[PDB]
Design a protein around this nucleic acid. Structure first.
Lengths: 184, 185, 135, 135, 183, 135, 183
DNA sequence: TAAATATAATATTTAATATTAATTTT
DNA sequence: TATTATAATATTAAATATTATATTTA
DNA sequence: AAAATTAATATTAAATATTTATTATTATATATTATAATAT
DNA sequence: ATATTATAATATATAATAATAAATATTTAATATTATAATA
């Protein structure tokens, strides 16, 4: 419902912030990595925010980039992950580091973050392995298909013949020979 | 709580928006039909936002003019309609298109929109014809007749109100079914 | 959480109302008597607003004065009646004649106000017998 | 969530206030001790407020100082104390007086506050004994 | 939870009935149609039942038939139907006649039910249209396989096979009697 | 959900009871009048019961008559009436005396029932004048 | 509140049942294996029933053995597991291979159960490996492939292969006796 | 002065589990 | 000229236990 | 040093039933491929 | 001796049906009130 604020840092204190917007200063909590990048009190700062909406109390959580807020929304949409758990997470590691650790299924790099046990690593890897894949049927097979089409095979029959056996680590000329020798 | 925001389009990321008013940006989601007429980033825009209050989240839903604003709030007032349903409906086609189709009662225009199936289409038709859209924004013979019509391609509603309009009383089947066949023309 | 509003009249679509304040428009619900008191569209006018909160939405109530707002609060504090019967009551009559009527304990004048029968009229009388002062 | 509020005092009505922050005047109630520090109507006054969110209401409680707001948060964090008990504690006595008497484990200085019995006093002292090792 | 009761009737105050099952009475209502099938005070009765759990109340509903319970449950699963509406509907008309009227999708026979609006009638008919279904021995299996080989569906064959001939009859005559039917 | 309970009195701790029905003994809350109509411990007895259901507890309120259960249902069907309030109502005096009082608008006799103020008594009078409708 | 029922099976329609326990019948939904090991309608039986409570509904899910009931309990204790998923997985297969596949970290065994995705089963592995602390041949596929390439329809050929497999005899002879079925 | 009695005001989550620090033994 | 059952609509919704402490009456 | 135990202690929050694009898979003519004799 | 083309098969683009999985939406019960049709 809220995406970003242009205000003035009326007061900083770990780990929250006060952003005086037209006389109105909002309680905004930020991670330590963001806190390091912030200028002094009274400076306009670029925080892209998301509000956590709970029945008894809300939470304003801003970030210097859209990507941080979006990944925090992904982390809070998770089953057993709360907000300040993920705040500790990107306080410990950056977006590229976390993304590469997920793609490498790394646990040792991220268990240094406090509050993270083995089951924390298990749940974060199992969710983030398939929630996002790219973060911001072969050339030899096609040559074989074209060669068998020129040899008289139908394109469907050539596709079936080249998909009949899983040729690996072999040249285009020899893979046709081993596929043609395969079924026969 | 929110009706209108005299402010500038801080960001444009489909389908969401950030609309800056005095430095305050808001997470605003609008249909694609709105996105066609939305000007460049930073330009002061005209967009009637709508708040939906949940126990877990809130979102803002902008509209260019009052007519689709009222259309959206009345559609969400239905028991079966959620926000993304009406968002897809407005993204697919315009208010005049949907009202002129509903008064024509064709589901085919409704169902080509992605995420819109048949059942949603007769729900829209029935529950809008249920008083919102006047303004722009048996016996053995009759049962035998109905069964014959079902066996001859008639859907039961046109076999039903034809019987209701011209019922047959104490006389043989062949003539009131004949005048009913003249009746449905 | 909100007590008063001071902004320019964005538009006039009764019985709803939009007040454009710092470029931000608020949906407020307004009495007909206040509709007789509103200026032209585009006029900076002060509205003394009260919010009601339910589980799925909220409604504001922009008012041109205080004591009408506190009498709204006192009425809606009753479990038997909600805000919109109060809207019908306040569109029916103003503060002083309502005060003398409840002090005179008459249901008949409350009957003519639309949407109100008899039993809710003595509900208003019984409940507001001993709540407020005469001002 | 407003952590600090700085607007002009639109009107004064005990125990509440209306702070017209560029057109919007919030229903804000502050303790009487802050009311002694409150300037007249129309002055730009800075409050370190905090919103209390309920299922049917939202309440703003402004504070001229950050630490009194922090103590308000500690008091409302207690299982039996809501906003108005902490309001009575803030209005009756001063923060340093509270911390000295908690270090002194006093009870009479607490019970003498109106609306406060022996039960609430012994509560606040014994569930507050564990804290304030940091200061 | 509750699926059926086999207890003794205690008192009759229509529509509210009390069913003393082993010392404890059960607050259950039955439709006036079921009032035309209740026994006397003190007589045992078996009622097919199904409960409804509300935020502040639990309501017990018991019918003479299990199929009536299932139709009631499917009516309650509808978004605009409360128990009072379903009781009004079934107090107006009985079950299979309402089923055929749902096949008919006609509002005339259901408007006459008191307290029922026409808009309610068409919305319930449209959202209740027919998506549901319409309301072994050696010789049995041999006939089923023979009619499967003859092209008849196994469910279609079985209902013609097991209906007319008796139990453990000669396979030829019972296949003959099963194929006696026409559409 | 239970409108009648033919059980055996297992325990007698007024105003609560245990009716051991086939080894199952539920908590049974009865008024002091029903306590006078109550037999001794171990006596089989039929109580005409009512259920109250809220989000954290269920209670049983067993009565000697149908009409007692129905009247208790219609008093708790009111907005501002709790269970113990109506318990004190029929504990103070008899049912038909209550019917005569509300048909005669006798607030005084209803005031002498303990736990009942003048305001609550006249509420009961006005919301029960026409609800009985002479049966 | 409730753990066990000992009554008489008044009615049994899958996947539920009606157990008339002292005059009161309960609609209890039980798995396919349980329905296989239940006795006929009218036979008394004792069932390991688990209490299921929603804010607007309540259910029972009974078992012939307790360990089924506790394993159902920790399955429902997971946020990401509903009752239908647990019922489907226990209806499809037995619990001993379930705990062994949890120890063996097997997924494709769980995936073949209907309604089970790869992510669902792999999550079940992820939390169950920490929850549990103490607690056909080559010729079979060759015959199917040969029949498919010969001209036989793929599923009826596998039906003939699995009707009389060559577990103790050669592939050619089991093909020979598999061609008996369709003649 | 000691409560009585409304009267009004004020207040109102829980299990259940995963981490971590201090301790304990080898 | 009132009078009453029926229906569509449009609201409104559901807390109560526990203290603190006024008058009041001895 | 080095793994196991336990008492605080902060944390987190519970979603099912349906529904519609999104993939499977089953005919049916119809613009193709084909041959044969046939003049030139 | 080359094409050619007058009759013969053919294979699939376009109709259809059948799971299926991501994505949502998630409240009616009681009661005044007011028309309203029919009525001493």
């Amino acid at each position: 419902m809220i995406g970003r604020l242009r205000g003035t840092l009326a007061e900083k204190q770990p780990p929250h912030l006060i952003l005086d917007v037209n006389g109105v200063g909002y309680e905004v909590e930020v991670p330590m990595t963001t806190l390091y990048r912030l200028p002094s009190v009274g400076e306009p700062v670029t925080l892209h925010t998301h509000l956590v909406v709970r029945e008894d109390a809300h939470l304003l959580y801003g970030f210097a980039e859209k990507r941080e807020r979006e990944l925090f929304r992904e982390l809070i949409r998770l089953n057993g992950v709360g907000p300040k758990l993920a705040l500790a997470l990107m306080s410990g590691l950056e977006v590229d580091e976390l993304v590469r650790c997920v793609q490498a299924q790394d646990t040792s790099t991220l268990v240094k973050i406090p509050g993270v046990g083995k089951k924390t690593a298990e749940r974060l890897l199992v969710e983030l392995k398939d929630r996002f894949k790219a973060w911001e049927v072969s050339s030899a097979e096609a040559d074989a298909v074209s060669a068998l089409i020129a040899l008289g095979f139908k394109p469907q029959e050539a596709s079936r013949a080249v998909a009949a056996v899983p040729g690996e680590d072999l040249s285009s000329e020899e893979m046709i020979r081993q596929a043609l020798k395969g079924m026969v």
